[PDB]
A and B are shown apart, each in its own frame.
Chain A
Amino acid sequence: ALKEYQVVGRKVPTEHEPVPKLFRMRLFAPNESVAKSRYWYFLKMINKVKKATGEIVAINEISEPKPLKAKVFGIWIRYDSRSGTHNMYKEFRDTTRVGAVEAMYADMAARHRARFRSIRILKVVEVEKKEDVRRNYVKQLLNPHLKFPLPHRRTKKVFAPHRPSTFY
């Protein structure tokens, strides 16, 4: 299960700079070991700050403030592929920001055969406004007349005596 970790890190003080800058990042990882490692990847990737010259000063797991209210989340990712340069924006409807990312990691792997290492989520933001939704399926999920038939569940107890009802 993924967890949203808030990681704050900075370079160690030296004679050149008395006080260093503080960098905070939000990223998703199963355990704090992965989050700290991914956080160091981004700073090197971005600020070109060495891990050996820096340290992690704060780590904190973040829980969903409103996990009982359905929301729509917009997610931006960067893709490393055969071309090695791509960027896409996707929308998901759920109750937990972490749940969107787990669902997000599912479709990239399903469609684009992508991996956890390649994807670097730039930003996740809740899209409260219905008009801001750019995806048709979410818009269909936002109508006041949501009522649809059941998707088939294809459910030892071998050798049933009677034909199953397989209906409502």
Chain B
Amino acid sequence: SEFQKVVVIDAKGHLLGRLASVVAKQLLGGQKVVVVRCEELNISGHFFRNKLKYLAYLRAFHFRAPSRIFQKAVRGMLPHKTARGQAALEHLQAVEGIPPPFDKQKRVVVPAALRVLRLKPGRKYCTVGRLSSEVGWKYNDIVAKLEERRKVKSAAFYQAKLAKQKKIASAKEASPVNQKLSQFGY
């Protein structure tokens, strides 16, 4: 449906293949896509299954960061040999965690890629950041530490916004104009 000039996507609980396919199609549509929390990406299958899949890949440059793992999946779904697919890649920014510039921006999700809406209950799935922890990535511990720090600050902002929202909500019914002409569904 409606689009935006730049899109920030929260990759928590999103399947790797499903999200990458939607992102790759959006990149070829000229949109600018920024994917945050790339280390919480989920892949269907046992963590043993993906460990050997990555270990087989280890046996070019074998990138270990979860963000570069996601970029590899997106890269394969683009015509990177041509200029059109080259420009699409430069319009994508995959990062782990939520950096400050995208910290205070709305983060949308893709229901077609969400694990809960796409994976059978009880199925074993592995987290990309957790999977990448035993392949060479050594920043998982600190990335989590900033994440809780960001969550505390984000929660404090939400309480301030919620407390402020209570003021307009209380004053919403105070004005008689709301009740007088609420026949329009508003």
Chain A in direct contact with chain B (Cβ < 8 angstroms): yes
Can you name the residue of chain B whose Cβ is closest to the Cβ of A164? B111
Asked if B118 contacts A154 (CB within 8 A), the reply is yes
The interface of chain B, by Cβ under 8 A from chain A, is 1, 4, 7, 9, 22, 26, 106, 108-112, 114, 116-118, 120-121
A1 sits at the interface (CB 8 A): no
Can you list 13 contacts pairing A with B, beta carbon distance less than 8 Å? Answer: A152-B121, A154-B118, A155-B117, A158-B110, A159-B7, A159-B9, A160-B110, A161-B106, A161-B109, A162-B109, A164-B116, A164-B117, A166-B117
Q: How far is the CA of A161 from the CA of B4 in the complex (A)?
A: 12
Of B7, B106, B110, B116, most buried by chain A (CB within 10 Å of CB) is B116
Minimum Cβ distance to chain A for residue B29 (Å): 11
Minimum Cβ distance to chain B for residue A148 (Å): 14
Main SS at interface, chain B: loop
Minimum Cβ distance to chain A for residue B41 (Å): 16
Asked if A159 contacts B110 (CB within 8 A), the reply is yes
The count of A-to-B residue pairs whose CB atoms sit within 8 angstroms is: 34
A147 sits at the interface (CB 8 A): no
Pairs of residues from A and B, 4 with the lowest C-beta to C-beta distance, nearest first: A159-B108, A160-B111, A157-B1, A166-B116
Chain B neighbourhood of A155, CB < 8 A: 111, 117
Of A154, A157, A158, A162, most buried by chain B (CB within 10 Å of CB) is A158
Chain A neighbourhood of B116, CB < 8 A: 164, 166
Chain B neighbourhood of A159, CB < 8 A: 4, 7, 9, 108-110
Chain B neighbourhood of A161, CB < 8 A: 106, 108-109
Q: How far is the CA of A82 from the CA of B23 in the complex (A)?
A: 47
Q: How far is the CA of A155 from the CA of B110 in the complex (A)?
A: 12
Chain A neighbourhood of B111, CB < 8 A: 155, 160, 164
Asked if B22 contacts A158 (CB within 8 A), the reply is yes
